[PDB]
Structure formats: structure tokens, C-alpha cells
Nucleic acid binder design. Structure first.
Ligand SMILES: Nc1ccn([C@@H]2O[C@H](COP(=O)(O)OP(=O)(O)OP(=O)(O)O)[C@@H](O)[C@H]2O)c(=O)n1
Length: 367
RNA sequence: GGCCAGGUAGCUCAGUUGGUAGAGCACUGGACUGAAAAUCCAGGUGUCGGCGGUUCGAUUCCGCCCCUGGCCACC
């Protein structure tokens, strides 16, 4: 219908950006980005009006948002910078060749992929490539983004792009960049499943030293990240119904050796979840003594009392120890699973004394 | 869209080792009155957002959502 209204309005609209990428990558998304030649706002308003749904105009930006079913649509008037602007100009201001492409929704040429910079080739050759040498200088944030993409799509930075990247970091542009955009980029990063590879790229191009103050790379942290990867794999395999956000764990491992001040400040800037802050504050201090108590554990009920109050994250951090692994697992798929019939419980009940009694019964069952 | 609070009576507000809920003014009924108010005895002041899950038991632990306010990312 978009091509039809665009025909009636004598306009030209296109699907543009990552949305194209994902389409060519077979990944179906519900957020579609349109670049319109001519007014995008009226097109959005008309389309929303025909489907009888609400519309959200942004005249100053020149964009409009509307939601149809589970489809989220964003229309944006073609602009040369971040006289009417051609599509090509809207695309050439973009970052990488794979994000620079477009697909025509106009009825005559419909289905056509419009690629000026050969983003199809770089998509085919698995290459992350900037459009212009100044691309990282324009937006230093891209430095992260590239790596992130290279992490997710398992692509490789071209020689050019790699050099320009390293140069961009060497100029310390990462410090000059807005803190918020960078922090948000990292937040996007840790949500990836391939985020570990992205961390490998972060170590390789040493961006974390620039973004995080006081952060340095060592081997213990890396091995901890791979062990955490294995634990995450197993937990997300058998316990997958219990899954939580995994990337934050890696983030905790990274900042583990950092000072509590810089750690708290970083987690503050990252707008981390409460359980992340709790698991961190618990890791920095009480974790050691907890481990030492887990070493002194003999009966199963002590392990119960020491574990059950803790979150899942803390337990996953406890699986990092070779000696504690099988113990944690035993607590997981066996120890905490048990119940009691009717008559027995009815005899148990005959305040808090009921709880203490039930605890005595559980420690009577375990040991 | 991310996060942080806030969600407790009609309104304005506190509450952690899960274990049988509170204040100031409106609400009913009666004692009191020619009627009413005040006042006394008292007692509703509540599935402590909604829905699942864990637990013998959840305002509390967790997950998914609703509402309001504030920091932002809003290519
Ligand atoms: N500094 C920047 C930032 C963004 N862009 C372009 O603007 C778009 C921003 O949308 P985004 O969601 O970041 O791209 P996606 O590929 O959709 O990423 P994702 O799907 O992971 O959101 C990108 O496609 C990119 O081509 C750019 O050219 N330069």
C-alpha cells in the first residue's frame, strides 16, 4: 500500500539501512526504516489514516512513526546531512556499505535492491567497510559499532577500515565522543550472543582502555570470560527456562579487578539492572568469604542455606571455581527439588516456628 | 526503546532477616438530638498495581505486563 500512496502522491519511498541488511540476511524484523523523496510526514499520516491507526509526527526532525499490528514503521525525509536531497545522498552519509543499501517499494521497480557502494559485495564477502576515510572521524561511536557488527555477523574489517579505525582510536577521538552514545553502544553490545567475540575485538583494538578509566587487559579475566562462556552455554542449555541477561555477567568479569568507585560509577552510567548492582557489590566483597564457607561445607543443608538466598547470577559466578562446580550443579538439578504429601504436612502444622520446623524436616531429609 | 524510583484506604503517607498489617480527615450503625453538628464507644478503613512461576506459605524472590514521574538513547 506504501507504493500505492507513494504513487498517488507522486513520491518515491525506499526501505533503508540495517532493515535491508537483515532482510538480505534472512532475519525478519518488525521495525522498518523508510527513506522518502518528498514529504514523509504526509505519507505516514495518510498510511496511518487508511489503516485507521494513530500517527506520531516529528516535523522538526522530518520523520514520522506509526504502528500497524506488530509492525513498527518509521518514515524519514531524505537528507544529505545529519534543496531536496536525493536517496543517494541519504545513503552516502551512512556508516558501512552493508548499511548503505536500499530496496524500492515503488510499484514499477518494486523489489529492486538499490546499492551504489557495492554493499552487496561486502555483505557477500563478509566485509565491514566504511564508505569514506573520514567516517570514524565524523562519528567515533562507529568504532564500536563496526566491531559489534564484525562480532555479530562474523565479518571482517577491510584493511582500509581497520587502518582508519586504529588511526581514529590513536587520535583519542573515543574520549572526545559523547559519553552517552558510547555507553549506549556498549549496552547494545552486551545484548549480543556473540558479544564475547566483540569483546575480543575490543581487546584487539583497545577501545575499552579509552572508554573505561583504569581498565587494563590480562589473561585471568579472559580465561574467566571463556569459562563464563561455557557456564552460560550449559545453563542456557539445560536450565534455559531460567535464563537471565548473560552479557552483564561478562561485564562484571571485566570490571572485577577495577576499583569499587569506578565500577559503581560505570554501572551507574550503564544504567545496569538492580540484580547486576547487587551481584557486583556481592562479588567485590562477600564472594570470597562465601567461597571459603563453601569449601568448609560438609552437609547438604549448609550448602542449601548458603546458596538458596542468592540470585542465579551469583551461582553462575560460583561455577567459575572448578571445585564448586559439581556442587552448584548438584544443588541445581537435585538438592532444591523436593516436596511432601498431605497427611504428613498436616501433622507438621499440628508462626515462624512452622518455618523452622519445616527447615528441620528438610535438613532431616537431605542428610 | 533502556534505566531509576514511585503504585498502601476516598485523599495525603511510613513498613526487609517471607510468618497472621498501620497514622491524620471522609464510611456505615447505635448511644446523644425537635432536626443537625460535635463528641464517646467503637469498629469497614485493604485480594498493599495486574497476571504467571518458585515456596507449606510471596506486599517481599523472579519473570511478563498496566499506570505515573524523572534521567536519556531518540540515525
Ligand atoms: N554514526 C552513524 C550511525 C548510524 N548510521 C546509519 O543509521 C542507521 C541507524 O540504525 P541502526 O538500528 O543503528 O542500524 P541497524 O542495522 O538497524 O542496527 P540494529 O538492526 O542492530 O538496530 C544504521 O543502519 C546506519 O547505517 C550511520 O550511517 N552513522
Amino acid at each position: 500500500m506504501v507504493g500505492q500512496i507513494a504513487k498517488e502522491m507522486g513520491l518515491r519511498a525506499y526501505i533503508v539501512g540495517g532493515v535491508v541488511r537483515d532482510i538480505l540476511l534472512g532475519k525478519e524484523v518488525w521495525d522498518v526504516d523508510f527513506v522518502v523523496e518528498g514529504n514523509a510526514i504526509e505519507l505516514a499520516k495518510e498510511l496511518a489514516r487508511r489503516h485507521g491507526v494513530n500517527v506520531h509526527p516529528f516535523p522538526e526532525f522530518g520523520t514520522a512513526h506509526l504502528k500497524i499490528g506488530k509492525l513498527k514503521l518509521e518514515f524519514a525525509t531524505a537528507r544529505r546531512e545529519t534543496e531536496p536531497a536525493s536517496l543517494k545522498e541519504d545513503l552516502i552519509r551512512r556508516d558501512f556499505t552493508i548499511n548503505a543499501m536500499a530496496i524500492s517499494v515503488n510499484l514499477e521497480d518494486y523489489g529492486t535492491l538499490i546499492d551504489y557502494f557495492g554493499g552487496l559485495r561486502d555483505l557477500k564477502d563478509k566485509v565491514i567497510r566504511v564508505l569514506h576515510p573520514v567516517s570514524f572521524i565524523e562519528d567515533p561511536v562507529r568504532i564500536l559499532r563496526a566491531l559489534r557488527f564484525a562480532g555479530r555477523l562474523n565479518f571482517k574489517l577491510s584493511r582500509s577500515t581497520e587502518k582508519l579505525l586504529k588511526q581514529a582510536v590513536n587520535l583519542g577521538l573515543l574520549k572526545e565522543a559523547p559519553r552517552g552514545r558510547l555507553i549506549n553502544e556498549i549496552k547494545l553490545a552486551l545484548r549480543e550472543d556473540r558479544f564475547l567475540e566483540i569483546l575480543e575485538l575490543y581487546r584487539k583494538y583497545r577501545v575499552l582502555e579509552e572508554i573505561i578509566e583504569g581498565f587494563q587487559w590480562n589473561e585471568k579475566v579472559l580465561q574467566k570470560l571463556y569459562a563464563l562462556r561455557k557456564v552460560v552455554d550449559w545453563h542456557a542449555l539445560e536450565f534455559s527456562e531460567e535464563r537471565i541477561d548473560y552479557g552483564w555477567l561478562y561485564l562484571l568479569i571485566l570490571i572485577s579487578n577495577l576499583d569499587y568507585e569506578r565500577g559503581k560509577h560505570f554501572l551507574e552510567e550503564m544504567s545496569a539492572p538492580s540484580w547486576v548492582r547487587e551481584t557486583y557489590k556481592f562479588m567485590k566483597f562477600k564472594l570470597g568469604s562465601l567461597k571459603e564457607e563453601l569449601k568448609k561445607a560438609k552437609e547438604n543443608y549448609e550448602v542449601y542455606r548458603l546458596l538458596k538466598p542468592l540470585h542465579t547470577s551469583v551461582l553462575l559466578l560460583l561455577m567459575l571455581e572448578e571445585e564448586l562446580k559439581e556442587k552448584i550443579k548438584l544443588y541445581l538439578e537435585k538438592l532444591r527439588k523436593v516436596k511432601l504429601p498431605k497427611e504428613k504436612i498436616e501433622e507438621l502444622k499440628k508462626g515462624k516456628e512452622l518455618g523452622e520446623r519445616i527447615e528441620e524436616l528438610k535438613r532431616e531429609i537431605m542428610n
